[model samples]
Target chain A: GLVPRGSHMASMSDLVNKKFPAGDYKFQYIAISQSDADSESCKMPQTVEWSKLISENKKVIITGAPAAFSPTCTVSHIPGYINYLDELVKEKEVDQVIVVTVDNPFANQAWAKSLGVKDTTHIKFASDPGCAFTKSIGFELAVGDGVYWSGRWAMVVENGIVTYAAKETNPGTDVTVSSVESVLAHL
Target chain B: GLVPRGSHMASMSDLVNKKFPAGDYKFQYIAISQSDADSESCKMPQTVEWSKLISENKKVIITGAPAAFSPTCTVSHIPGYINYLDELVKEKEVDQVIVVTVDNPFANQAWAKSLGVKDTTHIKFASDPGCAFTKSIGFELAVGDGVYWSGRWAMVVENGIVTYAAKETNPGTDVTVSSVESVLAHL
Candidate 1:
């Protein structure tokens, strides 16, 4: 439904003006300044520049979050994909599995590895480093003590086209697996 | 896949200890202490003793995250169901569209209204303030910042028995609309 019909998909152009459709420019490397990685001991650097990651694979899955350990992301949303990553990759539709958080890459990496997904060759462990990545996609959340980063969100890009997109209507209550799977099913 | 299946699902006694294979006990009441209504704003009260959220519902959908404003959930995951709530309810297979999040009631309520969800009469919006509900179901995330309240997960409950289940591998990268649809389809 987010993609709309007959248009083929909801791409960067659609989100350029609309908040929900901010496009995946952030993941596409739109010239972002460096971030502070040492803010937290668990903070990790942005895994790869968007361009660098895109060079290796064209089709990728991008998920956004305030932090890696956020409840929605850590407990169910991220884990849902991880549980089925093996099968999804085998489906031959996805190229890479990416994990992103508004915090430093270290937080993302720390959480990713903790879920036994330390070695996701097919999957990438990334960060927005100050939320640039999420902001680009229009997934940024307002800042606060409990909410400094964007809420949980997932998007699937095919050849740089956003074929599928979804996000929690609320901040913490996310359903990542069911929605993203819809994208792959169509593919 | 996370629980291994077969012997693991059949001999779910250990799940009681590990907090999985959720049956009648698969569901629990969630309540987060509200820090600030205007700021933190969750789904329910800042401090409530109990309610009939998890206990009374049948054919419920248990999702991850604390609040609702996340991307994947808003556009894809919850929309997948909200778009089909009528069919799910008419089929008599789904009684309540229970939305479980860690953002508590205040934040969760904001999401429900944002998505145009009026009330729980058909699709109930619930909250797990302390992550107790999520934790008891083997669906809680490791502490990360202050957002580690819940996980991104989903399950189909018929009379408290988990007939179908899907868990997101990582919050940053997983949400499956088709998977949740499949559960409803199966019912």
Candidate 2:
């Protein structure tokens, strides 16, 4: 069984003023120059260890969506963070915004390209194909049947310590607590 | 342990003239009209039961690739079927060409669109997020560590019985035996 949200996760609680989780959290991704049109060109996809990459950063915002290009996520949830990136970094002192989902990296790349922000350096898109990262944070949701997806949520981390965490109660549709505005207000 | 290809599969051998495999093999897919740009506009993705759809036809071709937009699949394997669809169906009587993978429906749909074949009704794309379809056929591959993906393979099913099957030894790169040219030659 999966742990529900609002539970005091020991692993995450230890990160309140501690360093980010230290372990392999690989994500499938393609370089920004790559196009889906050239996917058949015999080039292997690139991958990044999220834990290692984020550990070097000082301030960051991480958010999770159930699926890429799904109605709520595509239209409002992701767009909120992308559209407000400047304010989030300048006004809120956020260093990076990483968007995550249960999808593989290629799909996330395509989704970011479709949003016309594939070139943005401050915002990054990554995947959690195995639900490892999401489950570690206890943000895994049983969408339907026996399928599991990363629940809708957002967190702000400063110097490897989680400073703020917000999760949407109605992860299937609502985005209030996990909205970019909400994270900004807390900041 | 995962079953290797070329072993005499008793269950598959039982389906020469039988109907397609029973039980619901439903997949999640989004129509091409839906976009993440407009995902918040109140639209639900489309779904289809592969068994029911293929049962209506007399003969079919089903193949699985490791990932959508991966090099080998994007370039050689899937294109082999799409480019040879008419010849394969007209000359060899393949009723339908169904592409299944571990990707979710949206990723598959985006992959198809990237290849410029989203409108091809004869060649369909579907997802098996839990690897239900791939594992059932014993064509699952351990990509690395604990990650399992659909192996590269092709099958010719007459009505509901598999008449021919071939798999690439190295799913990451090989596709000779699973190509359209090879499948058509066998027919």
lDDT of each: 0.53, 0.72
**Model 2 misplaced regions, further than 4 Å:** A1-24, A33-47, A87-91, B1-24, B31-43, B86-92, B118-120
Off by over 4 Å in 1: A1-47, A145-148, A176-179, B1-187
Interface RMSD of 1: 10.9
Query: What is the alpha-carbon lDDT of model 1 when measured against the actual structure?
Result: 0.53
Best-fitting candidate, scored by DockQ:
2
Q: Which TM-score value belongs to model 1? A: 0.40
lDDT of 2 by residue, A62-136 (tens): 899988767688888999898898887787777788888877666777788787674435777777877777878
Model 2's CAPRI class is acceptable
**Candidate 1 lDDT, tens digit per residue, A31-65?**
11125333432232332456556556777777665
Provide the fnat value for model 1, as a fraction from 0 to 1.
Answer: 0.00
Chain B TM-score of predicted candidate 1 relative to the true chain B: 0.66
- The fraction of reference interface contacts (C-alpha pairs within 8 A across chains A and B) present in each candidate is 0.00, 0.34
Give the lDDT of residue B166 in candidate 1: 52
